[PDB]
Design a protein around this ligand. Structure first.
Ligand SMILES: Cc1cc2nc3c(=O)[nH]c(=O)nc-3n(C[C@H](O)[C@H](O)[C@H](O)COP(=O)(O)O)c2cc1C
Length: 307
């Protein structure tokens, strides 16, 4: 597992269509599914919920839940679909996450978290990792955070993705994640929260093992343009037009397979953010919502940049 760079799990954003797009920008970057509740994996349409394209590797499935055997079975299912990693959400503070007794709620029961992670780790051969917050607003202490990490490490976890803000406006404390690395040199820490550029990511990579970017990537996928070269050492550099042409081929195939065109197009609106004709690109796709509209938008862009 190369922990250096990942795109954050984002419900309603990081579905297989957006993940496919990001993969065209960076071959190296690790992708994460939207938070996927264990009960939905167990009782829902598993193929529809979990199937993904081989190009999306490396990819982690993020699960949420509260019961060891349920999460272990959901992890087995995720492993069967080919996921490279099973990530446990320990950071969701939403109203839903509270009623369901998962996400950030669980940190208040380290004993249970421990039993969950042991069960999950024994169930699958791929890595089981965690994504967590700094703590629950009010009683955020570094000692508490470290106590939580130590407990989860006893359960076998090695990779910790830490969204470096307390949950419930509490500030980012990336320094705490830097401190964690100092206290637990043998574990892997990926910091997350408010990182808006690759340059900012490289700043943090000097202190921790990895950086996870969420919102900045959805706002402008080409924030990752230099990642393959500057982070992964690959002699590769994407162009927006090349990515768009690859997305056109993907859309054509997906619509024939029964995918509504907007399911794909809604995630392509920012491909030319800040570029000449960037706003026209967005309007054309938003108004047209079809392969034909994408074709029109492509032609105008190809005339704009050239060859
Ligand atoms: C639209 C949206 C959806 C999110 N959904 C998830 C999720 O499914 N699982 C999760 O762990 N965090 C989720 N989060 C929290 C993010 O993964 C991430 O930790 C947070 O946005 C901070 O990183 P960023 O500043 O780079 O975006 C979501 C955030 C946003 C904005």
């Amino acid at each position: 597992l190369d922990p250096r760079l990942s795109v954050a799990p984002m419900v309603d954003r990081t579905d297989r269509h957006f993940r496919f797009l990001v993969r065209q920008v960076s071959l190296g970057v690790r992708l994460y599914t939207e938070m996927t509740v264990d009960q939905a994996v167990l009782r829902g349409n598993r193929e529809r919920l979990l199937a993904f394209r081989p190009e999306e590797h490396p990819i982690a499935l993020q699960l949420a839940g509260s019961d060891p055997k349920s999460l272990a079975e959901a992890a087995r299912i995720g492993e069967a679909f080919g996921y490279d990693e099973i990530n446990l959400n320990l950071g969701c503070p939403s109203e839903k996450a509270q009623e369901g007794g998962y996400g950030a709620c669980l940190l208040l029961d380290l004993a249970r978290v421990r039993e969950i992670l042991k069960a999950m780790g024994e169930a699958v051969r791929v890595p089981v990792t965690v994504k967590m917050r700094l703590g629950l607003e009010g009683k955020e202490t570094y000692r508490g955070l470290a106590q939580s990490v130590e407990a989860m490490a006893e359960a076998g976890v090695k990779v910790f993705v830490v969204h470096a803000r307390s949950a419930l406006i509490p500030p980012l404390r990336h320094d705490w994640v830097h401190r964690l690395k100092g206290d637990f040199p043998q574990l892997t820490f990926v910091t997350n929260g408010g990182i808006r550029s690759l340059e900012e990511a490289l700043f943090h990579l000097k202190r921790v093992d990895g950086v996870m970017l969420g919102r900045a990537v959805y706002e402008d996928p080409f924030v990752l343009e230099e990642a393959d070269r500057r982070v992964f050492g690959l002699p590769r550099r994407p162009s927006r037009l090349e990515v768009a042409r690859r997305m056109r081929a993907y859309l054509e195939e997906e619509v024939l397979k029964g995918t509504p065109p907007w399911a794909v197009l809604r995630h392509m609106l920012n491909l030319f953010r800040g570029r000449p004709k960037g706003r026209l690109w967005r309007r054309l796709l938003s108004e047209g919502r079809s392969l034909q509209a994408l074709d029109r938008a492509l032609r105008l862009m190809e005339e704009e940049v050239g060859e």
